[PDB]
UniProtKB/Swiss-Prot annotation, chain A:
Gene: FATA
MF-aspect GO terms: fatty acyl-[ACP] hydrolase activity
Lineage: superkingdom: Eukaryota
An example Gene Ontology biological process: fatty acid biosynthetic process
Role: Plays an essential role in chain termination during de novo fatty acid synthesis. Possesses high thioesterase activity for oleoyl-ACP versus other acyl-ACPs. Substrate preference is 18:1 > 18:0 > 16:1.
Keywords for this protein: Chloroplast, Fatty acid biosynthesis, Fatty acid metabolism, Hydrolase, Lipid biosynthesis, Lipid metabolism, Plastid, Transit peptide
Subcellular location: Plastid, Chloroplast
Active site: N187, H189, C224
Primary enzyme class: hydrolase
Protein name: Oleoyl-acyl carrier protein thioesterase 1, chloroplastic
UniProt source species: Arabidopsis thaliana
A GO CC annotation given for this chain: chloroplast
Residues of the full protein shown: 75 to 359 of 362
UniProt KW Lipid biosynthesis keyword: yes
Keyword Plastid: yes
Amino acid sequence: GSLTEDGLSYKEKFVVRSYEVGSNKTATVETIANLLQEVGCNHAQSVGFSTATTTTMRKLHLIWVTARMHIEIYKYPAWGDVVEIETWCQSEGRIGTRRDWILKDSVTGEVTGRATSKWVMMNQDTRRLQKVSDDVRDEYLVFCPQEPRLAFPEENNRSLKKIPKLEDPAQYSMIGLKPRRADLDMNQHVNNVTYIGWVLESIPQEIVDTHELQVITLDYRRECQQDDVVDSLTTTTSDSQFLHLLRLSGDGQEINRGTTLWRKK
Amino acid sequence: GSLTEDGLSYKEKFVVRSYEVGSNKTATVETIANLLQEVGCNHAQSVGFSATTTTMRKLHLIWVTARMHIEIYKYPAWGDVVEIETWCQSEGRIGTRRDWILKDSVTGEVTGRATSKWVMMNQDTRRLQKVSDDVRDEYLVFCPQEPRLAFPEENNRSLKKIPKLEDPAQYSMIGLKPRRADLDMNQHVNNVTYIGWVLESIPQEIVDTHELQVITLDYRRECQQDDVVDSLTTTTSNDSQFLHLLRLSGDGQEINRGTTLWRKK
Ligand SMILES: O=c1ccc(OC(F)F)c[nH]1
Ligand SMILES: O=c1ccc(OC(F)F)c[nH]1
């Protein structure tokens, strides 16, 4: 992959692997979510970040953490196909950061999906959220479009809707979910993609067999740690819509909420 | 990737991805095992398969893994290119072998090797059988005719008999369940998942302070989507050796056994 001409966005091509696809021989949403995160990392390497901590962030032990992940897929790429992913970052002034992605058929050049994500600043030791400094903004505005560039430009759009809290009892549930070493990143934290899978695990197999996932919106409230256990809850709200809750098996502490939308095949 | 000049082997290059690495910023043995399966699949595609031959599709026959053997000298680093070569060979009427060599792309030196034994099984009845001449002949056109062994040595750890762990196990991980990211395109648990499940009963202190050199895994029965696995480990030993058993948490039915060898970092 490479920075584009203006050095304000990054593109990479990926061949869809045998193990990356589900029962219709197209990419899972989790494969897709892993590819967004790889091209996010490849963009940060290309422009000097880490080896996405800036020099000021390293000083005060500050990190970016995902608050929100929104993905819309029109077509899942097939086993053996090339997908082109472009990604850029923007400042939401002092609130935090946004990363946006556009997914294209390499062969046709047509948009096959789009994703947006909200990142906020956290201490790392104390895990306390805060506003972005100001000294920090200047150091990464050099790497972002100055004019707004939005994967989801439409005024009132799915990617910005408030998500309510599922009320007990849930229509469906998958209890006793536990991460393994394959679910951890290189800093030994549970990978953000794992949560996407744990949310999807309470959807009935019959919906998955007969529908395609078109939109997922997931809020991240709190981390699941190595020795935690998650319950996954789902109620139909409706094309079919679901409301989703991830919480710890014990004390029922919320880790995530979300919604998904599925089309009939 | 592509077939070599003689068309009796297949080569492919892989860039190691952000999410594919552990705490050393090098590839996990599960990332390695996934890459081996992708190059195995790309070789079968290249020589005209879809990995069943005409006669097997007629008789509803498939290859299934009886054994995986993997030895790693160096785990490739995040961003590095690993080159993997692969070929099959007939083992008479017993089954087939698939063998792999991993190289540093930049240096050309061998950094891993792996060998696997596959047997013929009825898709439906799940009954093992010997390989028939009509089938042996259909796939010898793709295999080197002289022997080519990744593990040639006369007394080599890839062929040793593996004993059954005796209760009580020294270590255990209880209540392991596949999620949908553990399934392949045919909705069977991925052979790499059992590797991860075997590794989950190794204490974190061994993993933090040692590197996996060798893994040998036997495949007895598969885990269904709605089964639950227990993972057991006893130390059997400068080098730490362990003995492994995966079994179904209910009735204690054996799904896998194996051994691992680790060196101090
Ligand atoms: O561990 C955390 C804490 C917070 C968060 O999101 C923030 F917006 F609330 C994500 N992950
Ligand atoms: O379901 C099966 C059938 C066979 C097998 O391998 C064979 F060696 F036992 C593994 N898993």
